[PDB]
Amino acid sequence: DLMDEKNSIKPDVIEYAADILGDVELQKELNSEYEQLVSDRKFLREIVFVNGDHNW
Amino acid sequence: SALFDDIFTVQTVDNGRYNKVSRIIGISTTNSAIKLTLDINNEMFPVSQDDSLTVTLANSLSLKSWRPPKPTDKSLADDYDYVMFGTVYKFEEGDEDKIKVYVSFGGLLMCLEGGYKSLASLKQDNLYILIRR
Amino acid sequence: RQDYIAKVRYQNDLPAPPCPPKLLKYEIEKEAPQKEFLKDS
Amino acid sequence: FLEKYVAVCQEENYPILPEAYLVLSRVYENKDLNVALDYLMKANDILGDKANVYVLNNLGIYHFFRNNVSQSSDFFAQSLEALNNVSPQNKEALSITLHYNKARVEEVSNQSEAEKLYSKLMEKCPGYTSNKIRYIYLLALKSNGNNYADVQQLLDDFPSDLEVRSFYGWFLKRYGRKNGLKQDLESQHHKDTLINYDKHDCYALLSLGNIYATIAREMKVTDQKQNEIKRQQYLRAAQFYHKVLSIDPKNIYAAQGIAIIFSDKERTGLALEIFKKVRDTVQDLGTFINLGHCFMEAKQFGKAIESYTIALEKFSNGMDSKLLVLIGRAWYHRGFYEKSMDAYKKALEVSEQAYQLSKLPALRFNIVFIQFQIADFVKSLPNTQRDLTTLENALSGLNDAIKSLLKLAELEQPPYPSEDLKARATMGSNTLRNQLERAIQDQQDYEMSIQEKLRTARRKQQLDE
Amino acid sequence: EIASNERVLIDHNKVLRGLKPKDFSSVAKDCELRILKEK
């Protein structure tokens, strides 16, 4: 989350940590990534591996 | 030259399964919360409970193929009784002032727990441990 | 040079003599009891 | 041979002679006190009721060196009880010796009983020297060295005693400026002691080396000739220390003097190695202070901070102002060379505590200089590396530092000339205050821009939703 | 008689050794080579 300051990328790991908060296009990109990850989680957990096995 | 010096008292000596290797636990006299766990060779450097050891860490011995040392040349090791050479395989940046350094002296393991102030300079690839008693 | 004020003085003052308690020599630390003891039959 | 004798007697089941154990303890006195004490305990167990005054006294002294105060006191009490069975010829001498040992134990515990037994032994035997030395030493401690007449009388009583002369020289070194005596009087006394009594006494040689080092350090350097004379005095002191090392290579104080000379000669590495070896040998306040000084000269400011902190906690217990000054200086140096604000905050806090302990103009000027450096460093910092709170604290410290500079300028004898104080205060007030206010305005604008972006983003997100 | 019977555990020069002696022979040699022989 690029809005909440305590749930963002750490400032010592990126050199561009200043001009990162408040962006909306970048937040849209991050939301698209997270939605894709949630879709993957749903797919794997509900269709492919239903008993939770994840070492394949 | 040197990167860390301190004096420790041995709380426990664990021989375990081995006949020639013992694991000692020590705490710095001057600055508490600085712990030291170390595997040493019993035959060449025996230590007993409650002994006092002077532990020094250095990245070099000066003042790539190894060779037996000539008697003429001199190094930092001449002042100590027990010298080992290892590699740092984990530098743990943990809590606010809890730093763990793991070193492996050819399979003999060491863990130095302490604060960032003392152990900041221990972020190296290789380290010598010089021990005096 | 208007900077921090600090004085450096190395301390190498010799301490006062300790005057520890004196050991007492044994009876076998004197020559005549040694002569008496060694010449025992 | 004695170990073989013990083994043969044990194999033959024959009574081991305790005299062999006494001889073994006497031999191990110079090698291992633990083995000597164990053999003496075995001899005492073998004797049982046949224990003598000498065995009990040596056991008590062994436990005294082992810091076993309770066991040493019990052994001394048993020795005093067994003193009643001593033959009358040696009874007076052994009673004097046991009373001297008991007075030593009291001097460790409580000085009043020590002084009482010292007076009793002095009336009993005025000829003994150690009793008078210890009694005069306790009197000097109690009276803060106001008994120079007693020390001079003791020197006159035993001019040939090395212990008396060493104690007199120690008293001279301690209170020469208080008593207003000649600076070279102790030097001539030690020279006379070395020439006429014993030229191999390491105490007088170390005292002469310290006096010569002090003379060389206080000597003003103006040209090459004065530097050569100072180097000659240091060479004489080094010859004294080398003679001491020739007498005994295990002298920590000679190495300490050599390291001090090397520090004066800017040989930092050798002095650092010597001081580390001394710290490994013995741990007192002076060694830690010298290690901190050398680390400051070696630019290892963090190790200097640690050494000064360990020295303060171990010995000074947070009471000495000089160690606090050293801690503040080391923190200021680390903050200056590494551009760290927290080092400046810690130095300011330590200086404030030291001032609250002392309230001296020097520490007031130290606080002013620290606050001025803090304001300059914060102003030099970018907006992204600071915040409004640090700016406000720096500005308040700047105001307090200007007021304290004006206060120092009104004093009688400030550490620095009042014209310099006024000039620095004017120079800071004209420019640095305005630069701080501009930095505050820029920081406020930067925070407002951040908040505007944060509030505008959420509305667009809600509109998209 | 007291002087004959008295014995002191540690010597006047050896008092700095105590229960744990250490050698500074290398330090003395370096001091001789770098102060007395200093050029």
TrEMBL record, chain A:
Subcellular location, record wording: Nucleus
Membrane-spanning parts: none
Protein's job: DNA-dependent RNA polymerase catalyzes the transcription of DNA into RNA using the four ribonucleoside triphosphates as substrates.
Protein family per UniProt: Belongs to the RNA polymerase beta' chain family.
Name listed for the protein in its UniProt record: DNA-directed RNA polymerase subunit
Lineage of the species this protein comes from: Eukaryota, Fungi, Dikarya, Ascomycota, Saccharomycotina
Full-sequence portion shown in this chain: 901 to 956 of 1743
UniProtKB/TrEMBL annotation, chain B:
Taxonomy, superkingdom: Eukaryota
Keyword annotations of the record: Nucleus
Cell location: Nucleus
Biological process per Gene Ontology, one example term: transcription initiation at RNA polymerase II promoter
Similarity field: Belongs to the eukaryotic RPB8 RNA polymerase subunit family.
Listed PANTHER family: DNA-DIRECTED RNA POLYMERASES I, II, AND III SUBUNIT RPABC3 (PTHR10917)
Function description: DNA-dependent RNA polymerase catalyzes the transcription of DNA into RNA using the four ribonucleoside triphosphates as substrates. Common component of RNA polymerases I, II and III which synthesize ribosomal RNA precursors, mRNA precursors and many functional non-coding RNAs, and small RNAs, such as 5S rRNA and tRNAs, respectively.
The protein, known as: DNA-directed RNA polymerases I, II, and III subunit RPABC3
Organism encoding this protein: Komagataella phaffii (strain GS115 / ATCC 20864)
Lineage: Eukaryota, Fungi, Dikarya, Ascomycota, Saccharomycotina
UniProtKB/TrEMBL annotation, chain C:
Compartment(s): Nucleus
Full protein segment contained here: 7 to 47 of 393
Source species: Komagataella phaffii (strain GS115 / ATCC 20864)
Organismal lineage: Eukaryota, Fungi, Dikarya, Ascomycota, Saccharomycotina
Stretches of the chain forming a coiled coil according to its record: none
Protein name as catalogued: RNAP II-associated protein
Family: Belongs to the PAF1 family.
Top-level lineage group: Eukaryota
UniProtKB/TrEMBL annotation, chain E:
Localisation per UniProt entry: Nucleus
Domain of life: Eukaryota
Family affiliation: Belongs to the CDC73 family.
Name this protein carries in UniProt: Constituent of Paf1 complex with RNA polymerase II, Paf1p, Hpr1p, Ctr9, Leo1, Rtf1 and Ccr4p
Organism encoding this protein: Komagataella phaffii (strain GS115 / ATCC 20864) (Yeast)
